[PDB]
Amino acid sequence: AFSAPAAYLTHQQKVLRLYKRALRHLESWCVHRDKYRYFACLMRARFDEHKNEKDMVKATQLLRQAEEEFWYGQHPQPYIFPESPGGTSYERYECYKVPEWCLDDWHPSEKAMYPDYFAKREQWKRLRRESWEREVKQLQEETPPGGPRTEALPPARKEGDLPPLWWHIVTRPRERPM
Amino acid sequence: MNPFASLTLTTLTILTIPIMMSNSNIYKTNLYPNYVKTTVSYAFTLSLVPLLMFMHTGQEMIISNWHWMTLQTVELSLSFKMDYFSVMFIPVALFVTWSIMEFSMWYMHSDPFINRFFKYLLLFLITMMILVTANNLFQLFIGWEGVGIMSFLLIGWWHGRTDANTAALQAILYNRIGDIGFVLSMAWFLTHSNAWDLQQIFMLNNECPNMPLIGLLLAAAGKSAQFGLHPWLPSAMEGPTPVSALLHSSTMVVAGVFLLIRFYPLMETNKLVQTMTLCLGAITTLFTALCAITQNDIKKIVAFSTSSQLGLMMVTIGINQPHLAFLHICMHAFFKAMLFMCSGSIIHSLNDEQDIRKMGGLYKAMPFTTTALIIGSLALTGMPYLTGFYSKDLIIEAVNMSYTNAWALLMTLIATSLTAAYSTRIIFFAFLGKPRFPPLVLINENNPLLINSIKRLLIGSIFAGFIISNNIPPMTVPNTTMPLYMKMTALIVTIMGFMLALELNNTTYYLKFKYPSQTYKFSNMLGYYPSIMHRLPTYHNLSMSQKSASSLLDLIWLETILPKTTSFIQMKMSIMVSNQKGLIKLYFLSFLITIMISMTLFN
Amino acid sequence: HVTKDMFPGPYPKTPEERAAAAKKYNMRVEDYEPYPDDGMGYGDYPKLPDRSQQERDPWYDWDHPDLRLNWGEPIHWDLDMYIRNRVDTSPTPVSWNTMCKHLFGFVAFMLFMFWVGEIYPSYQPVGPKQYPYNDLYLERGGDPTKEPEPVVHYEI
Amino acid sequence: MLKIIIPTTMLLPMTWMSKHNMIWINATVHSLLISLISLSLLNQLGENSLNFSLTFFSDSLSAPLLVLTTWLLPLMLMASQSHLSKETTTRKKLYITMLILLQLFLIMTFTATELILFYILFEATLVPTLIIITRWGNQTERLNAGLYFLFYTLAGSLPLLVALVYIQNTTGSLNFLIIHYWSHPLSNSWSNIFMWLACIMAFMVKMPLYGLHLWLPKAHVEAPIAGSMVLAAVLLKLGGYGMMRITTILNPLTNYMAYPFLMLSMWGMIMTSSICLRQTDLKSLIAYSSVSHMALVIVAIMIQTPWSFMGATALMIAHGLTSSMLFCLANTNYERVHSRTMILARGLQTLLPLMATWWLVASLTNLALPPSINLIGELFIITASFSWSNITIILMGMNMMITALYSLYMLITTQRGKYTHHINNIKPSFTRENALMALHILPLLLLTLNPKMILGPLY
Amino acid sequence: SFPKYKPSRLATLPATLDPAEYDISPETRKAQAERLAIRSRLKREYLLQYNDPNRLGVIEDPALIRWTYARSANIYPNFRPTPKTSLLGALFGIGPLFFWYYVFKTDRDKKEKLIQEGKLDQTFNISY
């Protein structure tokens, strides 16, 4: 999620992803813990038979018939964690996520309550404001000519600098705002 | 004078006071849910009096209090019907709703908009009470649409979730498909019987034709989620557990069946519609049970069980036993609501975990939920002298001892077996094995709200069947004589299902793994009906709506025909007429030609 | 802030205007493919794959996570049809044809066997129910001034 | 009747002489007072009509339309007061003058005891609307829209005038009362067929008919908020009023000639409801919904039964109010967003809950939820069509299903989901917008208590 | 061996089952690198416009304007009368009208004939 994607997936990444999917779907098939442990160790042994293989064409032939076999026996109703992109509580709390700038439109009678919070917010806004001009310059001087090649942002290199484009990553509402 | 009317209107009237006070100050405090729960409990204990009067005397009423618009010879008025059905269904619904709000007090403890949730629940209850007591078709339609809109609002309670909005729109779509038949029935009844009142409709239809009954059957299939329009009920489990326990399990989803109960004088005079109803109920209950016996989400299993029970109710209606179907509604509300409450308690205890693959040993980890779920499953499958027996046993006997179709009876028996199968599946996969939940145990039941709400419906699910059956007057001829083997058909079928499903489930412990068969894939994917029917038609509609309706005709051809052709023709004629180089020779020659034509043509 | 040249135009026929259009829509020339040049007014708009937005990666950090869309990337012509609230093209564990055949066969078998059961009903070894007063003539329809044919029931 | 016309005329001098910062207040107050005065016309009789004089008369079909027309002006002023803030006093007074002139023309049109006077005012209503659309419009296409909104209308209306004068040469009077009392059957002839067409298509073009509905999306999209309100609420009902007034002399030729228009409306309601499903513009979607509802009204008028007429009147009133509310909500979104696209701004219920409630109520009342008067009119028309032929119920039910689908689609796309991240200029809704929504919605839920007030003369 | 999955329009081919993915080549790698470079440039522009504290408005999305304009305003100028378009327009704009006209006309002639013969039983039919 946080880490920037790569231009492509290597063979080891693909085999690791297949291993993850196969073990998860095997756990979905094998409800009980001991049965899952036995069959997962059996699957690990089946996977590590060809670990030391060197031929790239034969390696590509491998993992492909494995993906086909996985698709044939992929447990059409697999287990999904509640907050996962397929879970029952994937986006339950997205209706309670309110942006930070909404507080700028509060009535003064509402800002009369919670004065310390708005003072700290003022310090945060000043820090963002002073910081922003420098961040743009860093991005301008650090970005390779011809535009970025990978959507990875550099860290702050000086003392008083801050990571470029940090405001909307630091100011996420919450995971469970209410 | 005659307190029956005053009490039976006062219950519904006092059901609406918290809606009035929703704009007051109490709505902004945390005592609002307690206010609503107390109001509902008082409404139930107040409606217990008309039930007592009816049981004593058999007293029935029609209260046509307010006069709405009068349209020539057709008069529309605010009329409430207080027959056996209304005065019996109101207390049960109020009791279930009281239990549901008491449970939601604890289940929605951390929800910021809990007062709005309770207001929505009360509004749904008000709309359902409007639907049940309606004496004319317009008020019944008002309730029909109110319950649907409240279901739409409550399914999409978490509006930040895409799937909740999708499920709400699905439910609205299927209910409008039923609305088509409902409106057809209304139009036919007004055109031919000249009234929407129940009395005039019953009087002027000695032998009811096919079309109004087919419209009523379509509306009932739409609202009760029969086989043709089933998937919206399984998909409605996206809403909060109290919503699934109140609306989509016990009160709202029976409404369509109730409709067919209300028009039973016209139902018995038609044979084709009865056969269609019986076949639809049989196929619905079979298909829903078969889909249920292989699900992993507990809420989905309970919803499919509810749909199977609705199919059984439709079969009972089809075999000319409306009162028995009403009794089944009354018992099913009790035990299915309590079952859903147990499911919600388990769900909350395991940190919002719904799949049964992560639920292990709970027989000792949580005992009260265990005993409540066991009692509910026993009542649902049918244990003699329990609340489910007095209904389902008579259902089976009436099906066996009457002139029906063989296939419908076979599917009813197989559906009973599959009901036992998924009940034992739930119990085995959720209560018997070793624990499989995450290590951080947060199991807790020490809360009086949940315990009291569950135990009230427990006492109901144990005693209410006997009390109600022995209290109401006899409304049909009993099957006093029976073959000894055919007397025990339901019991042996249920026991066989229990034993076979337990034996099949016990083989999961075996250290052997085999790929699934085609039948398992068909049953797990809901007969593949949700895939095809939610991908093939919709696309083929939406694409057309942009290709032919929007672009081809509206944007191109309708534009080409009238405006663009006129513009092109006028531009061409203007260019031709105005393009004169200014040479008087050509104009003078044209004038000479015109003079010659005028001299040679106009004389 | 949008200029005239950054709006869709007619169908591109030469490679130069094809490259210009591909640059306009922020995509490679190789990836660019306009709709076939027929009467319908697609003009020069990329024919993106007909894949739905449900099966886009749900773990990537999209600028619009609900719609699963990025800011400047081209939008499919039928985007409103694929919004995760409508028709989705996600692959299924079983093939489309197999599911179609299974559903159709189940429905057809159910209908045929329901018709068969209608042809062959089930009943008990009993005669019709007997009713006392002229088969309840007076209480079913009425008409007391017609004197229906008297029916007498059997004692056995 | 002059007790309503004269204050509307005095609204002009008052606006011009009003202080440079007090035009809106005076206009709103006096328009509301004039609406209160016009409320008295609802007291109708079961007898003929309220014949005030030789020039103006009232009826229980004209009375609800007149009340709605008088009520719309304060709402139009309240909606227009927002986007005209940076505008010079003379031109704001000109805008108010155009609104007042349109209201005066509509008020005189709805009484119109004589058909030539009715035609004159019915075509005089065109000029202020065209000026409003082509002057105070945002996009460059407004001019084109104006042209369309003009010529279509005239393309239907110029033959009507000829027919009208021809009738006066044969009948001898174009007064509605004499025309009703001295009506004679039309022989099935080619000349009578063409006279029927000349009398009918002028009103069919403004409803609009499915074939002739092209001008409406353009005119509604490019017009300002007040123009959209007046077009959707009142200007579409002129065709229905004219048809109900003029179909008396067209019998019995109406039975044969109604078939093409009945088929066109019954299929175009489905076509426009399906078009609403795939729409990237809020105003266009509302316009197509208006087209569908007016197609249903056309079906009702062509069926020509008492229940048809009652349902038609109720549906016109309800649709006017509902469409005005929907356009107002869309304009409130646009004033913050400046894009007028459904998919751009999302999840507004999180930021503006009360406006989300207003959106929900508007969508529900457009969905024809009972016991709203929308449902009353729809059900009456459906029952009359079923009596006309039992097969219409399929198309009617399909239309209801698609209507519910696109209404909830409009609600969910804009209110539900996750908010757009980069949009930060979404300020809290003002008191003016909320008051506008409340003043739009409360009359509907009050009229559902007294339906007979809007059911027309055949009640 | 196992039964093969057959792709369809509404059930597309899985990502891990595409034969094209396993045919890796330098040209394909370069194409993917260029695609990710384009996406990275667009994302960088969007974030630069997004995190700016001075901005107090929506960020204009030229892709969205292009989509809306091509959907609505670019249809007719690119339209050409073609046998496909002519036939499809004629069908979808004329056929349903005549079909429904025939259906309703047949129904109404049947009803009128039944009324004329008097065998319709219109008792209690008062409201119409």
Ligand SMILES: CCCCCCCCCCCCCCCCCC(=O)OC[C@H](COP(=O)([O-])OCC(O)COP(=O)([O-])OC[C@@H](COC(=O)CCCCCCCCCCCCCCCCC)OC(=O)CCCCCCCCCCCCCCCCC)OC(=O)CCCCCCCCCCCCCCCCC
């Ligand atoms: C007159 C005397 C009366 C007495 C008669 C005799 C008494 C009873 C005799 C017993 C007869 C059979 C009972 C055993 C049932 C089978 C259970 C079993 O072994 O399942 C495992 C086995 C496969 O397991 P798996 O794939 O390895 O799953 C992996 C794990 O187990 C995954 O496990 P999991 O943890 O995920 O979940 C486990 C779950 C998942 O298991 C499943 O996958 C369920 C799927 C099969 C079970 C469903 C059986 C219900 C049959 C209703 C069908 C109605 C007609 C449908 C028409 C379809 C048309 C295509 O299994 C269960 O929980 C229990 C399943 C249901 C068994 C208990 C109730 C059934 C007994 C009642 C049947 C008749 C008695 C009625 C009594 C009334 C007196 C008349 O299932 C089968 O092999 C199928 C056996 C029978 C299926 C028949 C349908 C075949 C349709 C093909 C085409 C046919 C021609 C159509 C032509 C149409 C052309 C137009």
Ligand SMILES: CCCCCCCCCCCCCCCCC[C@@H](O)O[C@H](CO[C@H](O)CCCCCCCCCCCCCCC)COP(=O)(O)OCC[N+](C)(C)C
């Ligand atoms: C484009 C979007 C919609 C715009 C509005 C469209 C609706 C307007 C259509 C007007 C309705 C049809 C016009 C005439 C209908 C009369 C009935 C006729 O069709 O039936 C037969 C008529 O026969 C033939 O139809 C003869 C006429 C054929 C010539 C008409 C051209 C046909 C297609 C042209 C359509 C173009 C219309 C739009 C022009 C701009 C019956 O034969 P007959 O019993 O002997 O005649 C009875 C009438 N009498 C008694 C007066 C003599």
Ligand SMILES: CCCCCCCC/C=C\CCCCCCCC(=O)O[C@H](COC(=O)CCCCCCC/C=C/CCCCCCCC)COP(=O)(O)OCCN
């Ligand atoms: C949005 C665009 C819609 C355009 C509306 C056009 C439809 C109206 C019909 C065409 C105009 C006819 C106007 C006639 C006015 C009524 C007068 C009348 O009917 O009197 C007839 C006159 O009837 C006519 O002359 C009509 C002839 C038509 C001439 C103009 C043709 C215009 C185009 C016709 C084809 C289109 C037909 C359908 C158009 C529908 C619109 C799409 C009797 O004549 P007499 O000589 O007095 O009889 C003595 C013997 N008994």
